[PDB]
Amino acid sequence: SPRVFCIGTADTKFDELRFLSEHVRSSLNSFSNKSSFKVGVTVVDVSTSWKETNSCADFDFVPSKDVLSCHTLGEETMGTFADTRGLAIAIMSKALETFLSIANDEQNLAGVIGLGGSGGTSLLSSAFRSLPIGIPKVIISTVASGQTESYIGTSDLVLFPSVVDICGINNVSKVVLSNAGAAFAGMVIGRLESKFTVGVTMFGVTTPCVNAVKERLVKEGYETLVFHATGVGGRAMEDLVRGGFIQGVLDITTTEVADYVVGGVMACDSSRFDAILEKKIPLVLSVGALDMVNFGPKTTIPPEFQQRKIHEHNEQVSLMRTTVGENKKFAAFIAEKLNKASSSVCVCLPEKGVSALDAPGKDFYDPEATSCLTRELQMLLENNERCQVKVLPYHINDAEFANALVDSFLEISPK
Amino acid sequence: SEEIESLEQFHMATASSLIHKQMCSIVYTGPLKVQQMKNFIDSLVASLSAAVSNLVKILKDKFGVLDVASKRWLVKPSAKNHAWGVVETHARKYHVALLEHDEFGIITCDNWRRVAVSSESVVYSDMAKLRTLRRLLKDGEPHVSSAKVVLVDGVPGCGKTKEILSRVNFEEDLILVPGRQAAEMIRRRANASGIIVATKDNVRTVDSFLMNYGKGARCQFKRLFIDEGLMLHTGCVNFLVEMSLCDIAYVYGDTQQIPYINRVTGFPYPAHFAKLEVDEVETRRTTLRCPADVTHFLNQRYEGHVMCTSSEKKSVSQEMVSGAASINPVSKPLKGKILTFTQSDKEALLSRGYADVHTVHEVQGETYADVSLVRLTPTPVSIIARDSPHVLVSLSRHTKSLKYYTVVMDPLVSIIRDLERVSSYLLDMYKVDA
Numbered sequence: 001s002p003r004v005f006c007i008g009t010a011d012t013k014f015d016e017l018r019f020l021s022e023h024v025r026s027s028l029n030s031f032s033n034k035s036s037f038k039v040g041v042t043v044v045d046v047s048t049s050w051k052e053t054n055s056c057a058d059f060d061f062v063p064s065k066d067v068l069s070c071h072t073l074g075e076e077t078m079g080t081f082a083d084t085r086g087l088a089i090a091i092m093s094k095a096l097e098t099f100l101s102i103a104n105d106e107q108n109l110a111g112v113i114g115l116g117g118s119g120g121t122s123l124l125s126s127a128f129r130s131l132p133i134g135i136p137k138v139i140i141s142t143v144a145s146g147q148t149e150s151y152i153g154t155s156d157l158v159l160f161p162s163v164v165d166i167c168g169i170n171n172v173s174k175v176v177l178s179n180a181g182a183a184f185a186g187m188v189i190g191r192l193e194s195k196f197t198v199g200v201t202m203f204g205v206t207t208p209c210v211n212a213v214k215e216r217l218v219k220e221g222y223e224t225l226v227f228h229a230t231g232v233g234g235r236a237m238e239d240l241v242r243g244g245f246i247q248g249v250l251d252i253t254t255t256e257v258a259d260y261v262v263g264g265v266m267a268c269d270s271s272r273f274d275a276i277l278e279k280k281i282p283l284v285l286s287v288g289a290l291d292m293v294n295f296g297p298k299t300t301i302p303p304e305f306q307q308r309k310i311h312e313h314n315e316q317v318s319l320m321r322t323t324v325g326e327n328k329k330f331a332a333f334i335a336e337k338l339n340k341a342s343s344s345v346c347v348c349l350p351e352k353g354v355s356a357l358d359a360p361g362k363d364f365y366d367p368e369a370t371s372c373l374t375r376e377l378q379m380l381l382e383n384n385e386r387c388q389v390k391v392l393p394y395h396i397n398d399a400e401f402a403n404a405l406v407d408s409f410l411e412i413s414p415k
Numbered sequence: 416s417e418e419i420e421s422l423e424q425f426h427m428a429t430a431s432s433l434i435h436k437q438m439c440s441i442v443y444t445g446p447l448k449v450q451q452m453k454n455f456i457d458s459l460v461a462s463l464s465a466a467v468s469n470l471v472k473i474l475k476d477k478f479g480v481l482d483v484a485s486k487r488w489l490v491k492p493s494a495k496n497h498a499w500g501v502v503e504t505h506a507r508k509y510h511v512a513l514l515e516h517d518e519f520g521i522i523t524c525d526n527w528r529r530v531a532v533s534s535e536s537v538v539y540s541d542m543a544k545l546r547t548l549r550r551l552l553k554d555g556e557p558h559v560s561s562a563k564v565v566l567v568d569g570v571p572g573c574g575k576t577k578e579i580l581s582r583v584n585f586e587e588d589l590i591l592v593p594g595r596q597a598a599e600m601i602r603r604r605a606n607a608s609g610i611i612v613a614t615k616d617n618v619r620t621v622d623s624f625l626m627n628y629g630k631g632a633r634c635q636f637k638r639l640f641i642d643e644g645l646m647l648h649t650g651c652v653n654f655l656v657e658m659s660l661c662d663i664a665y666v667y668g669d670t671q672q673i674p675y676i677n678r679v680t681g682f683p684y685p686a687h688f689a690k691l692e693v694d695e696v697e698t699r700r701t702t703l704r705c706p707a708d709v710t711h712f713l714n715q716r717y718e719g720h721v722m723c724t725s726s727e728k729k730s731v732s733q734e735m736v737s738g739a740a741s742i743n744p745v746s747k748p749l750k751g752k753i754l755t756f757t758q759s760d761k762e763a764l765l766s767r768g769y770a771d772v773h774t775v776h777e778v779q780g781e782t783y784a785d786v787s788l789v790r791l792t793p794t795p796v797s798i799i800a801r802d803s804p805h806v807l808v809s810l811s812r813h814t815k816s817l818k819y820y821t822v823v824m825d826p827l828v829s830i831i832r833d834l835e836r837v838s839s840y841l842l843d844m845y846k847v848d849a
């Protein structure tokens with residue numbers, strides 16, 4: 001029996017929470033005029049002050065204390081914080097995540113919706129995006145206009161702008177809250193009343209390779225999802241991997257690894273590749289654009305790097321050429337992960353170059369680094385039975401390398 | 416006594432010979448511990464160069480200056496009986512000198528024209544330490560102890576001092592702590608059962624240990640206990656371990672208890688030097704003293720969750736006072752231990768007739784059931800900041816209650832106000848059996 005949850009800090013936004021819940025319940029009943037399964041609405045209070053709310057009109061209601069009592073302090077909140085409210089909100093956020101995780105297991109979670117300022121949005125966002133892609137996740141937020149990445153991440157979380165600060169039901173909020181609630185109900189009802197995909201990492205400097213590979217793959221009958229390797233791309237792909245949306249990966253551009261080691265703006269986190277290996281799905285990995293760490297503009301470039309070989313791609317971004325010593329570090333990080341594999345993995349290395357800038361007669365060209373990267377990889381993976389290392393006589397953007405990458409994928413994932 | 420003789424290497428040395436306008440391009444070599452020890456010595460060399468250099472600067476164009484011939488001050492200093500200073504001869508030469516005093520002031524020489532002293536030359540601790548530390552070096556290379564060093568990273572009231580007091584064998588071990596106040600409290604708590612087991616020999620301040628090393632007493636100890644070792648330069652801890660001749664050292668530390676600050680102007684103390692190198696790290700994250708709300712605060716300042724054995728949930732409150740004068744023993748009695756942040760405020764309350772008042776800094780490490788904290792100064796008080804070690808200490812002394820009386824709004828009012836607002840059910844999540 002489908003149920004949705006309306007969540008907010010009742011101690012500060014009780015009437016708005018009530019209004020929204022009220023409008024969501026009414027909308028769910030209207031839109032499903034075709035009828036069938038009835039959708040239940042439960043109101044959840046996530047207040048962190050001591051002010052207690054024991055009910056919300058005639059709605060099934062969960063008080064602040066019940067959300068917390070289902071939770072046990074974890075690593076997510078063991079760090080340091082700016083103030084007392086920030087820590088309280090962080091703990092409540094995780095407690096909410098646990099509460100929703102239980103709801104999604106022993107209950108039929110059909111969607112979640114909430115509202116809040118920067119604090120409430122921060123509290124709700126974290127918990128909401130932990131739910132599977134597809135499940136309606138909506139928040140009316142006073143901070144939907146501005147930097148939203150820390151709230152949305154790689155999820156399908158939707159932030160409806162509140163237009164004016166959330167403070168009581170007025171002629172403005174009535175409309176904003178009404179539309180948001182009607183949207184959520186629409187998403188919920190629509191969802192209730194109703195090919196092998198390969199993930200590929202890309203950069204401008206490796207697009208020739210990516211498009212060739214993509215075209216070949218489509219011809220082989222696969223569907224593809226391309227991810228810009230800006231740090232978020234790699235993560236977006238891996239979350240989709242654990243989400244069951246991707247059955248195979250051709251990690252052509254692993255450049256995010258460089259920014260992680262050196263300290264660039266488009267870096268991956270220490271968990272890169274983990275998701276792929278744990279799902280045990282076929283993986284063909286390469287070294288695309290591993291010759292550059294992202295920064296930009298020049299002035300931003302940390303002091304100790306202004307003495308490095310820089311390339312101004314444009315005004316806002318500049319690319320730094322990776323040294324020979326840094327590449328060995330890249331290999332260590334990659335190998336360290338790959339040596340944990342419990343399923344087939346193939347590493348394809350292009351002898352000629354790793355990017356359009358790392359080619360004969362190009363700015364970043366450095367066969368000394370390319371050569372080093374290759375050797376370190378072969379040696380670190382030499383005793384890995386699950387991994388094969390191929391060193392091809394081509395440049396990453398050559399059409400034959402692209403087709404070689406696909407061949408390697410086919411052999412570890414036959415069709 | 417015979418100490419001035421031990422510092423002869425510094426007496427009448429030219430001021431120039433002790434000044435180093437550099438110590439920024441210094442490159443250390445060898446094992447990390449060695450580099451830290453080398454760096455500790457240089458921090459002392461650098462602190463002395465600055466002290467000597469400022470005295471000379473004062474002579475060229477607190478900071479007192481004496482006219483030798485008239486035996487009268489041209490500029491009277493704040494302190495008295497300075498252990499040293501810089502002498503300016505008639506030829507206008509500058510020498511460092513260890514000073515002697517009699518009924519009529521500084522005992523001088525015929526070729527001395529003027530003498531300069533300052534807050535830095537009140538004591539010759541830096542020279543004393545250099546003397547001691549340099550005698551342990553063979554061509555600038557310090558010896559590293561083979562002893563096992565265990566670091567216990569803790570929080571307020573987790574039992575740092577309690578454990579030391581419970582595990583030390585007063586007949587074979589040594590307890591070192593920064594500051595006389597702390598050393599005195601440790602001895603007092605150790606001797607509270609009626610017998611004196613903690614003396615000047617098995618419980619010493621870090622400065623006394625470093626300065627009077629060899630002067631006698633006793634030098635070899637089986638185990639070394641350092642209370643609040645994170646208040647010291649890492650190289651200093653390395654020296655103490657080696658100098659105690661212990662086979663194992665327990666360094667009890669707290670990352671928020673006024674951590675070691677460089678202080679020396681333009682002196683290098685990189686992040687990898689600031690990290691103590693030990694054989695084993697232990698953690699203490701359960702406070703056995705503080706209420707659940709203070710614990711909420713502690714969670715914000717420490718890596719890792721902080722739990723509490725205490726049943727007390729909410730314990731802080733405050734009061735904005737309109738008339739600073741209204742705060743008097745008759746108008747409003749102050750419950751429990753009365754504390755202030757500054758000495759000025761401390762004197763004030765004492766003259767008003769309040770009994771047994773101390774500053775927060777004066778009661779570090781102490782425990783009280785109830786505390787009445789007071790701020791009478793409406794003027795800016797730098798040590799009263801959201802991230803100030805003093806505030807941390809001021810909030811973690813009580814087991815039962817704390818009330819802050821202030822004449823002006825400050826970050827502490829905010830902290831207490833926020834703590835009073837947090838949910839009690841959230842506060843319950845910090846509770847542990849023990």
Ligand SMILES: Nc1ncnc2c1ncn2[C@@H]1O[C@H](COP(=O)(O)OP(=O)(O)OP(O)(O)=S)[C@@H](O)[C@H]1O
Nearest residue numbers: 009012047048049085088117118119120833836837
């Ligand atoms: N000192 C505190 N301790 C614990 N919880 C607090 C404290 N102060 C406020 N809260 C709670 O934190 C939650 C969010 O407060 P809100 O005023 O609703 O913040 P918001 O409007 O969502 O976003 P901003 O930061 O105000 S724009 C509410 O449940 C408050 O009661």
Ligand SMILES: Nc1ncnc2c1ncn2[C@@H]1O[C@H](COP(=O)(O)OP(=O)(O)OP(O)(O)=S)[C@@H](O)[C@H]1O
Nearest residue numbers: 570571572573574575576577578703704780781782
């Ligand atoms: N006279 C006393 N009687 C009963 N309990 C005490 C007494 N003195 C201290 N305690 C308790 O001993 C426990 C820890 O005391 P300490 O080890 O001195 O605190 P700490 O770990 O050193 O942290 P600091 O130095 O105060 S920040 C706390 O639970 C105190 O309440």
Ligand SMILES: [Mg+2]
Nearest residue numbers: 078079714719
């Ligand atoms: Mg913490």
Ligand SMILES: [Mg+2]
Nearest residue numbers: 575576577780
């Ligand atoms: Mg202590």
